[PDB]
Amino acid sequence: PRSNKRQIKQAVKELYDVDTQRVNTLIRPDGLKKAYVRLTSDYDALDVANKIGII
C-alpha cells in the first residue's frame, strides 16, 4: 500500500518481463493496494497469466 504507480510499472517490468500501458490503483478497505494493470498492445495477457499460473 505504500507503493507508487511508477514503481509498480517498473516492478512488473522486472518480474514478468512485460511492458505496461496504464496502471490504475485502489486501496481496498483491508488496507491493501489493488493495481489493475493494462498491458501494451504488443503483448498478450493470457500468455503471461499461464506463465505465472493465475489460471
Binding site: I27, P29, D30, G31
Partner: protein, 49 residues
C-alpha cells in the same frame, strides 16, 4: 463519503476484528473460551473512529 486515509484504516481494522472465532480454537487443550466477547453490531454500538 470523503474520509482521510488514517480514518479508513481504523475503520478497516475493526471489520477484521468482527468475525467469529475459529472453530478449532475451542477444541485445543485447556481453553475456557466460548464465542467472541467483543463482537459488535453496526447499529447497536458505535465506534467514533
Amino acid at each position: 463519503s470523503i474520509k482521510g486515509l488514517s480514518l479508513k484504516k481504523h475503520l478497516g481494522r475493526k471489520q477484521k476484528q468482527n468475525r467469529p472465532i475459529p472453530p478449532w480454537i475451542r477444541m485445543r487443550t485447556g481453553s475456557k473460551i466460548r464465542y467472541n466477547a467483543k463482537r459488535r453490531h453496526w447499529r447497536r454500538t458505535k465506534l467514533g473512529m
